[PDB]
Design a binder for this molecule. Structure first.
Ligand SMILES: NC(=[NH2+])c1ccc(CNC(=O)[C@@H]2CCCN2C(=O)[C@H](N)Cc2ccccc2)cc1
Ligand code: NA
Ligand code: NA
Lengths: 11, 29, 251
């Protein structure tokens, strides 16, 4: 829940 | 890898981390 | 990691974080063993008593990290999984015997000051270092207590324990594919891996060639840092023939 979001390119 | 296990920020520039000597001292004598 | 300390930058450049795609969370630790192969614990990927069975598309590998939750722009590298390989005789039904899995990445990761593979032991280094009393180092972003969540990667050095003391500390059946580490209650010092540290490396620095070798994988424990209990680690050297077969057959 506390994770900063990763660049969308990786999902 | 030929270079495996050699850390760029420690072994590769001959720097030691703060607690690796604790391991060395345990490999007795 | 319980009773450990914050890592220095670049101290464990083979440390890998296994990350769940949705909900976005830490799943496990792991280690980099080449530019395309990552080593972890099988229970990180498959554990039917807990309804755990991840597939490649469920996960990401994050390499070069220090901060647990932050996206470390220009430092970490995030990689997709090509394929997972679990030991065919991994014993999830009983005692996590042969708790080891490999992951191949879709593309090779770029090495850097923060990203660098660890060595796997050959028979002689293992014979020389895997001795009661000799200390290794375990790293991870798992729980700080049995019952957070650290801000950054944690590290703790722990001595290997004699196999009879390992055996006498638990009712679980121990095998030659496992070893245990930790301080005894009369030794004063403490420390242990814990939930979330699963799959991360137990490493030792060889005094012969000053290289770091991965001797264990964080596997299991009863509670964390309890007196008279020890952490159990997969014995990497004993399962190395499987490791090499996979990489030799699949690249
Ligand atoms: N060093 C430690 N204190 C420690 C503790 C826990 C973990 C994470 N590993 C686990 O949580 C594993 C997953 C299956 C149950 N489990 C456990 O560690 C169980 N608590 C003990 C157990 C039960 C059945 C078979 C083998 C071991 C990793 C390290
Ligand atoms: Na026992
Ligand atoms: Na203990």
């Amino acid at each position: 829940g506390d994770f900063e979001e990763i660049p969308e390119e990786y999902l | 890898e030929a270079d495996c296990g050699l850390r760029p920020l420690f072994e590769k520039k001959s720097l030691e981390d703060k607690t690796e000597r604790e391991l060395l001292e345990s490999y007795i004598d | 990691i319980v009773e450990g300390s914050d890592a220095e930058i670049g101290m464990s450049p083979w440390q890998v974080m296994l990350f769940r795609k949705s909900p976005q969370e830490l799943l496990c630790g792991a280690s980099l063993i080449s530019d395309r192969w990552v080593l972890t614990a099988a229970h990180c990927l498959l554990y039917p008593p807990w309804d755990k069975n991840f597939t490649e598309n469920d996960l990401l590998v994050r390499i070069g990290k220090h901060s647990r939750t932050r996206y470390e722009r220009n430092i970490e590298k995030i990689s997709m999984l090509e394929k997972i390989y679990i030991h065919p005789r991994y014993n999830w039904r009983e005692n996590l015997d042969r708790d080891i899995a490999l992951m191949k990445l879709k593309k090779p990761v770029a090495f850097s000051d923060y990203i660098h593979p660890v060595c796997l032991p050959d028979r002689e280094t293992a014979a020389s270092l895997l001795q009661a009393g000799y200390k290794g180092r375990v790293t991870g972003w798992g729980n700080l207590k049995e019952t957070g969540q650290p801000s950054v990667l944690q590290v703790v050095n722990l001595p290997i324990v004699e196999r009879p003391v390992c055996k006498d500390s638990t009712r679980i059946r121990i095998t030659d594919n496992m070893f245990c580490a930790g301080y005894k209650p009369d030794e004063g010092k403490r420390g242990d891996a814990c939930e979330g540290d699963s799959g991360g490396p137990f490493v030792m620095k060889s005094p012969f060639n000053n290289r770091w070798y991965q001797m264990g994988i964080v596997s299991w424990g009863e509670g964390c840092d309890r007196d008279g209990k020890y952490g159990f680690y997969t014995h990497v050297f004993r399962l190395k023939k499987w490791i090499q077969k996979v990489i030799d057959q699949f690249g």
